[model samples]
Target: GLTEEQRMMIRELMDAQMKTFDTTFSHFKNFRLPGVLSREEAAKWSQVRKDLCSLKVSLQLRGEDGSVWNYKPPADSGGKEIFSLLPHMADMSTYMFKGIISFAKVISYFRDLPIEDQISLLKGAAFELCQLRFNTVFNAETGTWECGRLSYCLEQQLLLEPMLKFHYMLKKLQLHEEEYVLMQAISLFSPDRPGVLQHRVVDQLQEQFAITLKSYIECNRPQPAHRFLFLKIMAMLTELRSINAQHTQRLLRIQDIHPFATPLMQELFGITSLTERHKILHRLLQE
Candidate 1:
């Protein structure tokens, strides 16, 4: 009944966020220069090697203009140049964290939900939402995210191979900003995450956003019975979830080697599972 009202609210939240994101990137001209790390810092590579006992997922993190993948191969990066970029990549995430917080705050819709449900939603969907956000700058042909000063290229195949396909497919849809943000909202409101309690409320919210998303696609494409396009976009959410699982697994395996920049980063990556995600998010919100 109130779907249109909810849709407008959701659209405004994402519109404002994406506008800010575009503004942030508008300042950069051209730069992909990688920085060098100190030998003292260089020595730190040993820990990653000791953990080199690790596996795959998330080869990069992208910024306003470009994507930032983690590896550059042993011979190319020698871990020095790559490590220096961690702080930069983490800052990009920090911006995203702020934007996500802003969305939930305006929707205090979320603030009203049970704390347990809130935690379950964030734990389940943060990565997928962030992936949608990052996709704005992804280049399917080049496999690069062209951040202003700091740019990222896909360094390895295993983690990024699926991404190229994923990235290419999503961009081909040529979704409007409305579509992108609606998908983010729909992803966030999922009721099926592992620990979710009270699925009915969350489930309803998703349907509102889903109908909103469907309405936009139909109006935009205006073709007969091509509702298949809407279903295809819905399918991409599953693809995102699958990609997120790979990232979670890879993060668990790799975080032991090189620490992520902040406690938030650790929580986001699922580095440690001991009630840390909820507490960390609450602590983050307090400030």
Candidate 2:
């Protein structure tokens, strides 16, 4: 009985939780790697990731479609090593799934109301979703602020600080509807930019993580180096950046459309393409 917005919220929450646990596993495993667990834990988390992929597909009724978003563990995967960590992840996954389901119940029951109220509920969902992701990603409990700082440092002349400033401003501006939701919308896709090439390149190793699980049947292979997974993390970051850029671009373009149309409506004319309207805006901004 979940509404569309509620269902989407649950989906995003689930993915965010999965990413948090995955990052935690990667970070701990990465730190001990090369010197201690380079091969061993790589083999371990690889299987774990593989098993998670399997669950995503089988239980969610999603078929492998070859998109990175639709990625799955190989069908010929799993063994004693894979199951060893299963109990732990089982508890983690259950905790997150239950939380999402419980929230979904509330979403299902919320009565429809005035247009303003409807928009408020929608904005509430978006705001909470962003905060959920922010907490998981920054992981303040673990001093991951350093990690966030490092990530921001690597981007757009430390544009990360300004970006976060703008993000916070938007978050505070409107609870039901405002520029904040657009920020969240853009953020959902910020992982594909080109600057994060280094991260993407390293993620290729995860491809091999699946290979290791399929080729060998042991959890004791040396863990992959954190260096190997850096690209993977970076790649996702780049992706998000690109998505954010596109979203902002659309918003800016839409604003231009609004002013142009508002004036034109009084004079009696047809709607204009955002692209052409922007061309004219180029001249106006200069004057």
Candidate 3:
């Protein structure tokens, strides 16, 4: 039932959002530029971090509902830089979460879904969706992220070895902005979540997005190698999930060190359990 017109419409909407995002986050983009920030810029950057840590989304989705896997590594195995950067990374995660959810608001069909279906799709796809946006910060040649005057090696960013392993493979391909936007939507409409209220509708939506993504690749990048590259990007989604799991594990360790120091961090990486109750109780006792 998906039509080319529909695909084009979706593409147009996404392209508009991309432009709006560029405008909205221009300050953040400037932060990544080389050289020191002026005192005013530093203050603004700090405020951004503080806002990300404190701001709450209206959605009820817990951090644990997202794609974070639970696998604790041996003690003290991570690089010191990783730990030192955990809070900042948590801030980044929160910022990404806000942007992703805000972008969700713009998807006309997505907003039309039943609340439960919306939550299901988000729970299953948020990480993968954000990965497309995160790709911008990545420098494939150097295997580093340019974050506000500091270049972070993937290891220091807590992406773990798998992301590093795949960097070279992905570096060989030239990805365009349109492809990334299509990929984000393709990942976001997944129907296989644990509690999807409308599987048929979700599946149909996903199928439409997938067709659009495939057609975009074939029509725009018709090289034989480009076909393989499309498949490779699809395959990378699985790896992205693994990398998100590793990040969750690292954040869990950081949480242990300082429980719920960042509210949005708790929403992105905190475990959902009786422990949350303990955190509240602890906070009350301290108060």
Off by over 4 Å in 2: 1-79, 108-287
1 or 3: which has the higher lDDT?
A: 1
Q: With candidate 3 superimposed using the best TM-score fit, by how many Å does residue 283's alpha carbon deviate from the native? A: 24
Q: Which ten residues in a row have the lowest lDDT in candidate 1?
A: 50-59
Task: Give lDDT per model, in order.
Answer: 0.64, 0.30, 0.54
1-287, model 1: which lDDT tens digit per residue? 33567567656657556544543454433323234435854455554543332222233435545654454433323454334445555666655665565565455556677767776777788778766877877766676665543445654443444545677788888787778878877888899988778799899988978987777776667677566888999999988888788766655544555556456766656555324556877654444
Best by TM-score: 1
Model 3 alpha-carbon miss at residue 84, Å: 1.9
Arrange candidates, best TM-score first: 1, 3, 2
By lDDT, the best candidate is 1
What does candidate 2's lDDT look like per residue over 1-287, in tens digits?
33464346445434434543333222221111011115875555554443333222211111236322111223434433323223332333333323322332233122222222222222223223333334344422232222211211111322244334333333332222211222233222222322222333323432333333222222222355332332333333344454444433432343332222232221112223322433332222222
lDDT, candidate 3, residue 180?
71
lDDT (10s digit) by residue, model 3, range 243-278: 666656654554544444356445334454333433
- The order by descending lDDT is 1, 3, 2
